[PDB]
Design an enzyme around this catalytic site. Structure first.
Site, PDB file in Angstrom:
ATOM      1  N   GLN A  58      -7.486   4.409  -3.811  1.00 34.90           N
ATOM      2  CA  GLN A  58      -7.395   5.742  -3.240  1.00 34.90           C
ATOM      3  C   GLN A  58      -6.484   5.753  -2.022  1.00 34.90           C
ATOM      4  O   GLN A  58      -6.361   4.755  -1.309  1.00 34.90           O
ATOM      5  CB  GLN A  58      -8.776   6.249  -2.842  1.00 34.90           C
ATOM      6  CG  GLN A  58      -9.736   6.388  -3.983  1.00 34.90           C
ATOM      7  CD  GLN A  58     -11.116   6.786  -3.529  1.00 34.90           C
ATOM      8  OE1 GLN A  58     -11.419   7.968  -3.387  1.00 34.90           O
ATOM      9  NE2 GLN A  58     -11.970   5.799  -3.303  1.00 34.90           N
ATOM     10  N   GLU A  59      -5.854   6.910  -1.793  1.00 37.98           N
ATOM     11  CA  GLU A  59      -4.983   7.177  -0.645  1.00 37.98           C
ATOM     12  C   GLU A  59      -3.862   6.140  -0.539  1.00 37.98           C
ATOM     13  O   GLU A  59      -3.760   5.394   0.433  1.00 37.98           O
ATOM     14  CB  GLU A  59      -5.792   7.254   0.654  1.00 37.98           C
ATOM     15  CG  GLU A  59      -6.666   8.489   0.784  1.00 37.98           C
ATOM     16  CD  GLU A  59      -5.886   9.727   1.183  1.00 37.98           C
ATOM     17  OE1 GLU A  59      -4.714   9.593   1.589  1.00 37.98           O
ATOM     18  OE2 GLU A  59      -6.449  10.838   1.093  1.00 37.98           O
ATOM     19  N   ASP A  60      -3.041   6.099  -1.591  1.00 40.63           N
ATOM     20  CA  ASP A  60      -1.849   5.271  -1.775  1.00 40.63           C
ATOM     21  C   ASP A  60      -2.140   3.787  -1.946  1.00 40.63           C
ATOM     22  O   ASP A  60      -1.195   3.013  -2.082  1.00 40.63           O
ATOM     23  CB  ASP A  60      -0.827   5.429  -0.641  1.00 40.63           C
ATOM     24  CG  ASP A  60      -0.410   6.863  -0.434  1.00 40.63           C
ATOM     25  OD1 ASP A  60      -0.773   7.715  -1.270  1.00 40.63           O
ATOM     26  OD2 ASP A  60       0.280   7.143   0.569  1.00 40.63           O
ATOM     27  N   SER A  61      -3.397   3.359  -1.951  1.00 36.95           N
ATOM     28  CA  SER A  61      -3.674   1.968  -2.264  1.00 36.95           C
ATOM     29  C   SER A  61      -3.409   1.700  -3.741  1.00 36.95           C
ATOM     30  O   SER A  61      -3.345   2.613  -4.566  1.00 36.95           O
ATOM     31  CB  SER A  61      -5.119   1.607  -1.930  1.00 36.95           C
ATOM     32  OG  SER A  61      -5.433   1.902  -0.588  1.00 36.95           O
ATOM     33  N   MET A  62      -3.238   0.428  -4.071  1.00 36.68           N
ATOM     34  CA  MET A  62      -3.062   0.038  -5.458  1.00 36.68           C
ATOM     35  C   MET A  62      -3.884  -1.209  -5.729  1.00 36.68           C
ATOM     36  O   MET A  62      -4.081  -2.033  -4.836  1.00 36.68           O
ATOM     37  CB  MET A  62      -1.591  -0.214  -5.793  1.00 36.68           C
ATOM     38  CG  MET A  62      -0.888  -1.156  -4.842  1.00 36.68           C
ATOM     39  SD  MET A  62       0.902  -1.079  -5.003  1.00 36.68           S
ATOM     40  CE  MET A  62       1.159   0.690  -4.979  1.00 36.68           C
TER      41      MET A  62
END
Ligand SMILES: [Zn+2]
Ligand SMILES: [Zn+2]
Ligand SMILES: [Zn+2]
EC number: 2.7.7.6
Lengths: 69, 49, 310, 45, 49, 42, 56
Positions: free
Chosen positions: E2-6
């Site tokens: 979430q929120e640009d994490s991968m």
């Protein structure tokens, strides 16, 4: 810079298929897809390992060795 | 078990940027102080504050 | 004599002198290595200007220059006020001489170490009673020569005379006086072992530069260096000037390596008389075996029959 | 005393303290320190 | 993620995915400040340094 | 008169070297920059 | 104020000198003795004061 030993995604050994991949292109005149399918790379995770590889070790081997025996 | 939603899937070109966490993680309990203000120094390479 | 004002970092619990003291710079502490007790915390690890109190002394001066909003009238008056100061006349003339040192070294493409060595040699030999009547150009030239010799990069007298117009006699006397007072200051201060830096000959250091002036390859230069090293054993030419020894060694190895450069071109380039070069080659023809590098003729790159006879 | 390799001609040299750093065969002033003789251990991960 | 994490595959990382070389060069010179104030490349000892 | 003293080549040499080593263009900043060698496209 | 700020105190005739904690002498490689800018300015002030004293 040299062909990876294994496919990154699944772990199939693709490092032993690089020298036969070049032979299927230069003297068998196959296109790249048939050459990949002939070597047994049926998953596109394995196909991108050989198809997209750049052989930068050939450019590195043109330089003279610093420690020459 | 099968996911109820099907997943968009395929190769994509990704780049590794030069921002590593190991070049950015920083902590300081106590350390060297500046000569002038006697406050903590600046910069993680100097164990700064 | 005088107040102590000295702080010693001794552990008050181990009571061991001298104490094993670790300066934990990352944690900003000074600790005892035996018990771990800290001694001084909040230690100090830009804002000013670098000034070495060995080249120009303890002189702290700032100049006046144009700012963002500056009138021309106010700057000139302050410049004339700064110029009309009587207490720094010695400082003004020594900075002028240092500027002349930098101008002469920069006109020679000498390295920065030569500039620093010449500057400190001028400073050490400045204001000497034994050195008062000599010309400023002679002091200049001898300081440059001393700086060249100290950095193992020594030029010749002809080089310095080519830059600085100074007579040979006064330049030699000035060099002798400055060498004497430099040895005296070394004995009074930090003693320095010469280990062949004030050597009069220094003919090994002229071979690469003189070969570069002729555009010779490297193997000719190293063969000439070996020849000049072995020329010291020859007692017939041991009294010759090292310029002449270097030139005749270079010419011998030019004839050995079949390089198409005549004696006239070598004499024109390095300002040695062609008769002197020819006589040096004639007197070195009898000792061909010792001068020529044995491994060169062993590898077959050169042969002794290439040298023309006399 | 210590082994070096010239950068361009790749000739092994032995230099002491007083020796100027310069190749004795081709004269290139760039010299590389020789690789260490002790065996170095790498995890194959 | 979430929120640009991968979420990266650890098994892929183990096989060399995005593994990189890092080189850092340190330069050092021995400068001659004067006659006796000169630097030397040497292995220092605790007795005399 | 010495021609070697008349022409100070260090003026030209040091001026070009200073204005290319630093970004300063005179005696405009940032004119000369250290070349980026992170990637080829960079 | 009569006690804290008289106008006659607006004219400087006895310049206070800040201690070396205000103007520390930095080290570039712990062998140079580079001084602060305030030390240089105080040296210039002292030189001007000595010059004016000698001229008077
Ligand atoms: Zn695969
Ligand atoms: Zn203790
Ligand atoms: Zn070499």
């Amino acid at each position: 810079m040299i062909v990876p030993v294994r496919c990154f995604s699944c772990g199939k050994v693709v490092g032993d298929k690089w020298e036969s991949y070049l032979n299927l292109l230069q003297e068998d005149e196959l296109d790249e897809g048939t050459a990949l399918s002939r070597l047994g790379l049926k998953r596109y995770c394995c196909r991108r390992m050989i198809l997209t590889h750049v052989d930068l070790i050939e450019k590195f081997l043109r330089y003279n060795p610093l420690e020459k025996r | 078990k099968k996911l109820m939603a099907q997943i968009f899937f395929g190769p994509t070109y990704y780049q590794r940027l030069r921002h590593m966490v190991d070049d950015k993680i920083h902590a300081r309990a106590r350390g060297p102080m500046q000569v002038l203000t006697r406050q903590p120094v600046e910069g993680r390479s100097r164990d700064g504050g | 004599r005088g107040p102590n004002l000295n702080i010693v970092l001794t552990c008050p619990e181990c009571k061991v002198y001298p104490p094993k003291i670790v300066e934990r710079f990352s944690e900003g502490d000074v600790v005892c290595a035996l018990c771990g007790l800290v001694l001084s915390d909040k230690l100090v690890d830009r804002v000013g200007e670098a000034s070495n109190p060995l080249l120009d002394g303890n002189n702290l001066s700032t100049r006046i220059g144009k700012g963002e909003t500056t009138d021309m009238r106010f700057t000139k008056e302050l410049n004339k006020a700064q110029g009309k100061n009587v207490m720094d006349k010695k400082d003004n003339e020594v900075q002028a001489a240092f500027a002349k040192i930098t101008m002469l070294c920069d006109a020679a493409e000498l390295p920065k170490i030569v500039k620093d060595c010449a500057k400190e040699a001028y400073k050490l030999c400045h204001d000497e009673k034994t050195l008062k009547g000599k010309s400023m150009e002679s002091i200049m030239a001898a300081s440059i020569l001393i700086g060249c010799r100290r950095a193992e990069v020594a030029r010749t007298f002809k080089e310095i005379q080519s830059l600085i117009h100074v007579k040979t006699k006064e330049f030699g006397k000035t060099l002798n006086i400055m060498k004497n007072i430099l040895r005296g200051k070394s004995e009074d201060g930090f003693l320095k072992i010469d280990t062949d830096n004030m050597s009069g000959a220094q003919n090994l250091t002229y071979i690469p530069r003189f070969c570069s002036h002729l555009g010779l390859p490297m193997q000719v230069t190293t063969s000439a260096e070996y020849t000049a090293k072995k020329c010291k054993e020859i007692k017939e030419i041991a009294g010759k000037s090292p310029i002449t020894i270097a030139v005749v060694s270079i010419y011998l190895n030019i004839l050995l390596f079949q390089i198409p450069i005549t004696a006239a071109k070598v004499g024109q380039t390095l300002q040695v008389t062609e008769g002197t070069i020819k006589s040096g080659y004639k007197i070195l023809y009898e000792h061909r075996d010792k001068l020529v590098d044995p491994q060169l003729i062993a590898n077959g790159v050169v042969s002794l029959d290439n040298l023309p006879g006399v | 005393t210590l082994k070096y390799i010239c950068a361009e001609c790749s000739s092994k040299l032995s230099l002491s303290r007083t020796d100027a750093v310069r190749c004795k065969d081709c004269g290139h002033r760039i010299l590389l320190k020789a690789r260490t003789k002790r065996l170095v251990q790498f995890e194959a991960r | 993620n979430q929120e640009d994490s991968m979420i990266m595959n650890q098994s892929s990382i183990d096989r060399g995915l995005f593994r990189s070389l890092f080189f850092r060069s340190y330069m050092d010179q021995e400068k001659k400040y004067g006659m006796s104030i000169t630097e030397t490349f040497e292995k220092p000892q605790r007795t005399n340094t | 008169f010495n021609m070697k003293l008349a022409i100070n080549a260090k003026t030209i040499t040091s001026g070009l070297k200073y204005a290319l080593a630093t970004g300063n263009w005179g005696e405009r900043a940032g004119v000369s920059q250290v070349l980026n060698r992170y990637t080829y496209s960079s | 104020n009569e006690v804290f700020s008289r106008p006659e105190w607006m004219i400087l005739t006895c310049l206070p000198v800040p201690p070396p904690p205000v103007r520390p002498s930095i080290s570039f490689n712990e062998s140079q003795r580079g001084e602060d800018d305030l030390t240089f300015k105080l040296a210039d002030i002292l030189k001007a004061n000595i010059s004016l004293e000698t001229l008077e």
